[PDB]
Design an enzyme around this catalytic site. Sequence first.
Site, PDB file in Angstrom:
ATOM      1  N   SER A 159       0.793  -1.215   0.000  1.00  0.00           N
ATOM      2  CA  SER A 159       0.000   0.000   0.000  1.00  0.00           C
ATOM      3  C   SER A 159       0.823   1.262   0.000  1.00  0.00           C
ATOM      4  O   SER A 159       1.851   1.362   0.654  1.00  0.00           O
ATOM      5  CB  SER A 159      -0.984   0.070   1.169  1.00  0.00           C
ATOM      6  N   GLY A 160       0.398   2.262  -0.784  1.00  0.00           N
ATOM      7  CA  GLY A 160       1.113   3.513  -0.933  1.00  0.00           C
ATOM      8  C   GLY A 160       2.209   3.488  -1.955  1.00  0.00           C
ATOM      9  O   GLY A 160       2.965   4.443  -2.093  1.00  0.00           O
ATOM     10  N   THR A 170      -2.794   1.953  -7.056  1.00  0.00           N
ATOM     11  CA  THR A 170      -4.089   2.523  -7.373  1.00  0.00           C
ATOM     12  C   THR A 170      -3.975   3.491  -8.526  1.00  0.00           C
ATOM     13  O   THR A 170      -4.742   3.441  -9.484  1.00  0.00           O
ATOM     14  CB  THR A 170      -4.711   3.228  -6.185  1.00  0.00           C
ATOM     15  N   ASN A 211       0.224  -1.699   7.198  1.00  0.00           N
ATOM     16  CA  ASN A 211      -0.496  -0.905   6.221  1.00  0.00           C
ATOM     17  C   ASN A 211      -1.805  -0.426   6.808  1.00  0.00           C
ATOM     18  O   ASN A 211      -2.542  -1.178   7.439  1.00  0.00           O
ATOM     19  CB  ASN A 211      -0.836  -1.722   4.949  1.00  0.00           C
ATOM     20  N   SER A 253      -5.190  -1.523   3.263  1.00  0.00           N
ATOM     21  CA  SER A 253      -4.696  -2.616   2.444  1.00  0.00           C
ATOM     22  C   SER A 253      -5.851  -3.343   1.808  1.00  0.00           C
ATOM     23  O   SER A 253      -6.796  -3.725   2.480  1.00  0.00           O
ATOM     24  CB  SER A 253      -3.893  -3.621   3.308  1.00  0.00           C
ATOM     25  N   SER A 254      -5.767  -3.629   0.499  1.00  0.00           N
ATOM     26  CA  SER A 254      -6.741  -4.441  -0.201  1.00  0.00           C
ATOM     27  C   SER A 254      -6.512  -5.887   0.123  1.00  0.00           C
ATOM     28  O   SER A 254      -5.392  -6.362   0.114  1.00  0.00           O
ATOM     29  CB  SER A 254      -6.697  -4.274  -1.725  1.00  0.00           C
ATOM     30  N   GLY A 273       1.096  -7.406  -2.394  1.00  0.00           N
ATOM     31  CA  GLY A 273       2.363  -8.093  -2.596  1.00  0.00           C
ATOM     32  C   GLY A 273       2.739  -9.006  -1.467  1.00  0.00           C
ATOM     33  O   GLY A 273       1.948  -9.361  -0.649  1.00  0.00           O
ATOM     34  N   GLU A 316       3.609  -9.585   1.845  1.00  0.00           N
ATOM     35  CA  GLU A 316       3.429  -8.844   3.061  1.00  0.00           C
ATOM     36  C   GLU A 316       3.634  -9.764   4.241  1.00  0.00           C
ATOM     37  O   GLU A 316       3.103 -10.867   4.291  1.00  0.00           O
ATOM     38  CB  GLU A 316       2.023  -8.219   3.088  1.00  0.00           C
TER      39      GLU A 316
END
Lengths: 797, 367
Positions: free
Chosen positions: A152-153, A157, A199, A202-203, A452, A454
């Site tokens: 994330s970040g 997106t 995160n 996070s998706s 990814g 994680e």
Amino acid sequence: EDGKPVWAPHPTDGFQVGNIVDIGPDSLTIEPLNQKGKTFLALINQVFPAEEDSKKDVEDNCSLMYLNEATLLHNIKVRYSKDRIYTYVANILIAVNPYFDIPKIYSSETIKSYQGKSLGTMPPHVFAIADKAFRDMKVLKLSQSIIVSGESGAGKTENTKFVLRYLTESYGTGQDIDDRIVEANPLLEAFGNAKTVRNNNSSRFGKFVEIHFNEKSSVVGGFVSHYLLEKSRICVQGKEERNYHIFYRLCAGASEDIRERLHLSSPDNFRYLNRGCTRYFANKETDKQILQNRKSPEYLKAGSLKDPLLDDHGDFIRMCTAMKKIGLDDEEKLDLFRVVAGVLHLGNIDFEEAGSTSGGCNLKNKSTQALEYCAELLGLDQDDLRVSLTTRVMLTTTVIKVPLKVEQANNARDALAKTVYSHLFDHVVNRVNQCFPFETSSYFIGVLDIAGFEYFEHNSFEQFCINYCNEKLQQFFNERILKEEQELYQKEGLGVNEVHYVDNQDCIDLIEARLVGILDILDEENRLPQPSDQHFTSAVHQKHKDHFRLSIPRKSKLAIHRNIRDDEGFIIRHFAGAVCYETTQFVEKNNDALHMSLESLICESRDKFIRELFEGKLSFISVGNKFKTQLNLLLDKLRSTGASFIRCIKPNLKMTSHHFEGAQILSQLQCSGMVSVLDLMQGGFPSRASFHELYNMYKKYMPDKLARLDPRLFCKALFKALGLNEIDYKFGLTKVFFRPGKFAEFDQIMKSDPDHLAELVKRVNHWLICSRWKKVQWCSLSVIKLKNKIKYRAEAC
Amino acid sequence: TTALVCDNGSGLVKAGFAGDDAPRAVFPSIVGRPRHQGVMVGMGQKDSYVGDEAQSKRGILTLKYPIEHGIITNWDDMEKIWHHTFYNELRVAPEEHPTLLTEAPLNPKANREKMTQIMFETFNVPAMYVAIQAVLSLYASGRTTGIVLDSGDGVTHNVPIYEGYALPHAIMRLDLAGRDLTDYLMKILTERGYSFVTTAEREIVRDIKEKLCYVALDFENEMATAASSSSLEKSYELPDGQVITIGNERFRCPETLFQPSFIGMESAGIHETTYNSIMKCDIDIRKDLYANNVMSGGTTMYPGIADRMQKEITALAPSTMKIKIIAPPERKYSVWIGGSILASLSTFQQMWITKQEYDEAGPSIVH
């Protein structure tokens, strides 16, 4: 070589410049270049050769003399201060988020500049991948896929939105589907996105936004598909983690004319929220707008969670604005809140032991008013629901009711919450796909976005399914890279050659093989009359006693992992290294027990919105198999399409502009699978330079006669003069290809004795005159054969 | 890293890092193999259960104490004790810490060598030393003179130490207390009709040996009041629901420490072995051995000691001599609090036998 710079392991920068001033059997005594006298020790596998000119950057990383992860890290360090955020590594795009809008790069004039231009001849950009994927769709006669990874970040997106922008501008003539995903992004920020230890947003699902193309090459529709979900997170969370964001944004953003209808209370009350973190994300202004009765004791003690973008009170407003735009009315919006509130009042139901009368379990007396306020949200009767949460209904053909044990009723009550919320998220996605129905279907270009590799200090069952999903995607990643390199060598006329492939099938068989795999033992432990987690851990090293992909926790170098007892965890080596997992609560999080007596009751609801969610044998079902079965429906779909791997890099922890952290970027190069693919390419020819590149580099060292030549004959004469070995050096069609360390060896031959080089050019002077004759003679015979083609063709008209 | 003091109990193996509070792990030394066939299908059963798990799974195993009569039965079971202790109780790797191990005084050679040698090659500790349990109890009580008692199931010892030198000529080892007191209690509880003959059930006997027994002021006068109708009986409850009422045997069992003729063994009581070791020391030193009589070990935790011991010694000792018997709380952990003080001190860091020195020297460095 001696005297030549190598890269040195520096903790704050990853790698820095340095020299070797002493050596031993396993270690090198490294003296830094900039910090002389600091002289440390480093191992044989921790040092890497560096290039002579380090002040230059390359758009294409195959133009490096030494291709490794230390020269890749320095290439994206120099490009970061030149604001060049896109980097070409073969069929892999490395994009680094700058956290600032770069001028002219998103321009429509820039979009129509890239359109139809050859590959590699235009600067690296995300529009050069999207234009290639349209051309390797229609020409290839096969569908395409864009694969987006990272944490994330990292800009995953934003890179997705530039792909959908290019398809509805460069090739799609009309169709405003591009921003309907963007406009209903806050719905998936509530339902699918959660909070993890590393995160904040996070998706937790496999987002597969596909774009349908017809045979006439027009955008005819799109479709959003979802794969995977953390079943455990719905009912039980880890330390300091949250559940999904709709179970905090509905609590934070609800009004009092909504709270009286859903009977909402503060998160401390609810067992599916009080296990983890109950705090809301907010800012100073919205902290004043959160009502007193929505605040938990933890919220009073520690206040709101700090994030620059997340606001659980304000994003509930921008969620309900997006439900008005997408296609939901206020009555249908309220029915998407009645199901969520019914899950909250389900988790507080407890089960004691029956008074010897017929065995089984009964509900607790403190759980009586809690059932009355839950059964009207589910549209069922409280006396029929009490039977269904305690009995196993079967027939003898009469229909008997056989009670369940206490632990099986706690697992069945949470299995109802992991079934209702599972079909609720599938109803939200299907409702969104009915707000933009596709006209027809034929070819497709989709974007797969997922989290990814994680991992945390102590890893859970939720991270075990993420790293198992990334290992299967790592198998298909290296499978597509080897196929691209084998059809590159053929295209340049080098033909077939032997290359060594690295397998990870033994790690896959360890996790998922029939009867012996880790997920297969886990699903068998649920069938036992008394499940255990100590029996699960000992059974893993019972059946897998040998192998290198698995060890005991005490074998680890890390002190934290050495404190774990043998029957409390295990270490599984993956592509990103050795990851430990604890086994406490592993079986409990896997165990789901949705049985007939309860599955055929929630489908039978008196409510109509609930029956729409759900569209003997098998009893307890197979829970550890649903994680393997659903993933195989995506892996064979990825094998059936082409692929466009876009790896996304986060440059710093703060997520602020113009900051480079090489102790965090290097960890994402080794957790993206990038370093593994660079290992693969050493087997082939990793260094390759075009004829115009070798002309600009080496013309100054050559005699004036040889310098006058065109780039291809300059390189052909130079290869013939030196007499280079055919298995090490290869003359292609547009590029010269090299074995590892032989572009570097080549560069030292040019920097060696000018008189010796001049004498070798004298010795090839007859061949060079003969080559320059045949070049203009066969080019004039080419124009005459194309004159004879124009006449031959027009003879049949 | 922090040094680890691991005490080779007779009981009751004790383990905890160096300083400053209390032991982290204490457990009953028992290993037990399963004496019946399993029918569950999991299978889920261990090859050998150690304590504590072997004290929760009584009656389906055959309990075997690995140290008996002050010497280890085999190092195959002993290594499992060690492995269990370090890994699944203390949660520490031996390569991380210098260790401090304990032994019993007058233990046969070559059992300190073989122990030291096996422990260095099996667990790969970076340094080690082996101290006798009795010497450590001086530090625990903050004394520098006195006769030290290491009394565990089933070897007691009587070692005299004078500021700050040890006297080899007066060291006494009695194989008297406490496991033979356990066996004797089982023999005089059968006399009241309770049959506890089996290995597992012997632990229950040990537990009533702890809790319900007491020492008399004078045997003959306690026996007199036993003949009277007044109740000395205490009612114990047993795991299967049975109620056991013991009285006369309640003071008979510990009294054996002053009268071994109850077991029929020839050896003399703690009373006389204390006196006879003092009267094997030089005349000037005898003065300070009296009033530095320090009891230690868990088997000295009966209530009527030390004031029985006091009254008996004062009767045999010379008139007008000052006699005080030192018996603090917590005697079972005395040894550990001793070891803790030792391993923290400078310069005793350089008294440890380190791995390179051991590798060069071999088993001959031990002594």
